[PDB]
Design a protein around this motif. Structure first.
Motif, PDB file in Angstrom:
ATOM      1  N   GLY A   1      90.163  72.000  52.379  1.00 14.35           N
ATOM      2  CA  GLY A   1      90.780  72.327  51.010  1.00 14.35           C
ATOM      3  C   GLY A   1      91.932  71.529  50.470  1.00 14.35           C
ATOM      4  N   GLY A   2      92.351  71.597  49.463  1.00 12.83           N
ATOM      5  CA  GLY A   2      93.550  70.850  49.256  1.00 12.83           C
ATOM      6  C   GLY A   2      93.091  69.897  47.928  1.00 12.83           C
ATOM      7  N   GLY A   3      91.952  69.806  47.809  1.00 11.61           N
ATOM      8  CA  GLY A   3      91.498  68.750  46.463  1.00 11.61           C
ATOM      9  C   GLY A   3      91.247  67.389  47.170  1.00 11.61           C
ATOM     10  N   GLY A   4      90.704  66.632  46.139  1.00 14.36           N
ATOM     11  CA  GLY A   4      90.389  65.412  46.375  1.00 14.36           C
ATOM     12  C   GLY A   4      91.571  64.070  46.483  1.00 14.36           C
ATOM     13  N   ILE A   5      91.298  63.120  46.753  1.00 12.22           N
ATOM     14  CA  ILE A   5      92.209  61.960  47.027  1.00 12.22           C
ATOM     15  C   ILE A   5      92.106  60.872  45.880  1.00 12.22           C
ATOM     16  N   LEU A   6      93.564  60.552  45.268  1.00 15.74           N
ATOM     17  CA  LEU A   6      93.702  59.706  44.122  1.00 15.74           C
ATOM     18  C   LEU A   6      95.229  59.291  44.102  1.00 15.74           C
ATOM     19  N   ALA A   7      95.611  58.893  43.112  1.00 16.61           N
ATOM     20  CA  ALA A   7      96.935  58.422  42.939  1.00 16.61           C
ATOM     21  C   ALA A   7      98.024  58.658  41.851  1.00 16.61           C
TER      22      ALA A   7
END
Length: 183
Positions: A26-32
């Protein structure tokens, strides 16, 4: 121990391939997000699928091994006034040993990462960064909150960000709200 990395489907991870980073816990996706001219810091965020990552070794075999030094870059970034580049790079911090940033307009070649096994049974992996000769003073890439609430990808000896690598779902990715910068 050198072994080949698997994507979430159980296929060999491809050199130069592009994958969605998919945290199993969990925690969500990766971006900036913009860190104020300005620079982009790599973050995890709930309710975001995230942006795919292109993964390339310094040698040219078809498949990626856990023993290979790797260059990582976002396969997508939005138009922005901070940087043209999408290469992952490590920079110092007054709050952590380091954080994962994107290279500025003059540093298009990023830092070297390794993909290491976290759970062989479930094909879970983690990212680590090393220094010196290439495999010295190794550190995990984890997630931690900065003063402004962003869940930053950080250099740490603490618990890592656990990952799987998903083949790109062209639907979940291209959703317009997912493609905008986190503010």
């Amino acid at each position: 121990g050198s072994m080949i990395v698997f994507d979430s489907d159980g296929d060999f991870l491809r050199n130069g391939g592009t994958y969605m980073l998919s945290p199993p816990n969990g925690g969500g996706g990766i971006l900036a997000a913009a860190i104020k001219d300005c620079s982009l810091g790599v973050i995890q965020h709930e309710s975001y699928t995230g942006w795919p990552v292109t993964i390339s070794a310094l040698v040219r075999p078809t498949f990626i091994s856990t023993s290979f030094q790797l260059l990582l870059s976002f396969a997508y970034i939005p138009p922005n006034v901070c940087t043209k580049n999408s290469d992952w790079i490590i920079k110092s911090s007054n709050d952590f040993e380091g954080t994962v940033m994107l290279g500025d307009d003059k540093n298009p070649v990023g830092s070297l990462f390794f993909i290491k096994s976290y759970d062989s049974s479930k094909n879970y992996y983690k990212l680590v960064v090393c220094g010196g000769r290439g495999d010295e003073h190794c550190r995990n890439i984890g997630v931690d909150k900065d003063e402004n609430g962003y869940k930053r990808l950080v250099v740490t000896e603490g618990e890592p960000l656990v990952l799987q690598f998903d083949k790109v779902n062209k639907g979940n990715f291209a959703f317009e709200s997912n493609l905008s910068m986190v503010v």
